[PDB]
UniProtKB/Swiss-Prot annotation:
The NET domain mediates interaction with a number of chromatin proteins involved in transcription regulation (NSD3, JMJD6, CHD4, GLTSCR1 and ATAD5). The C-terminal (CTD) region mediates interaction and recruitment of CDK9 and CCNT1 subunits of the P-TEFb complex. It is also required for maintenance of higher-order chromatin structure. It comes from Homo sapiens. The gene is BRD4. JQ1, a thieno-triazolo-1,4-diazepine derivative, and I-BET, a benzodiazepine derivative, have been tested on tumors with success. Treatment with GSK1210151A (I-BET151, a I-BET derivative) has strong effets on mixed lineage leukemia and promotes myeloid differentiation and leukemia stem-cell depletion. There is a cross-link at residue 58 (Glycyl lysine isopeptide (Lys-Gly) (interchain with G-Cter in SUMO2)). Residues 17-123 form the Bromo domain. This is Bromodomain-containing protein 4. Belongs to the BET family. Chromatin reader protein that recognizes and binds acetylated histones and plays a key role in transmission of epigenetic memory across cell divisions and transcription regulation. Remains associated with acetylated chromatin throughout the entire cell cycle and provides epigenetic memory for postmitotic G1 gene transcription by preserving acetylated chromatin status and maintaining high-order chromatin structure. During interphase, plays a key role in regulating the transcription of signal-inducible genes by associating with the P-TEFb complex and recruiting it to promoters. The record marks 99 as: Acetylated histone binding.
Length: 127
């Protein structure tokens, strides 16, 4: 029933890079999903106490959300595109694992995921 600490968004000894792919992940991918009418349940970590989801963190062991991804991108937390891409996939997958097929939250994740795929399809070549 209690909330874990959020995922890490700062770590001084973690290696990191600023790259055209990671810039595309922020400027195009994150920006496009963030603005969407279904973005709101995905803009911060799930609060299991406020939402009354006491099982959430007994089921979801690698939590992820766009608030976390946004801070990672803004704070140049990543080494490569694939790390960031994995965070999005974890976010969508957790939603489908926890929630009941057909629930509104699943339909919202599905709309964001469709856009995500369309945008990562055009991930630019590394420079
Ligand atoms: N059942 C459920 N609710 C939510 C969810 C619902 C509501 Br109202 C507001 C917020 C803000 C973070 O989370 C929210 C989820 N966000 C991601 N997966 C979620 N699964």
């Amino acid at each position: 029933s209690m909330n874990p600490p959020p995922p890490e968004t700062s770590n001084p000894n973690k290696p990191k890079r600023q790259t055209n792919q990671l810039q595309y992940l922020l400027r195009v991918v994150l920006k496009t999903l963030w603005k969407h009418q279904f973005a709101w349940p995905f803009q911060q970590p799930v609060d299991a106490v406020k939402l009354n989801l006491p099982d959430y963190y007994k089921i979801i062991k690698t939590p992820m959300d766009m608030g976390t991804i946004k801070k990672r991108l803004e704070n140049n937390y990543y080494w490569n595109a694939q790390e960031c891409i994995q965070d999005f996939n974890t976010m969508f997958t957790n939603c489908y694992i926890y929630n009941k097929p057909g629930d509104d939250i699943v339909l919202m994740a599905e709309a964001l995921e469709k856009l995500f795929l369309q945008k990562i399809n055009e991930l630019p070549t590394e420079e």
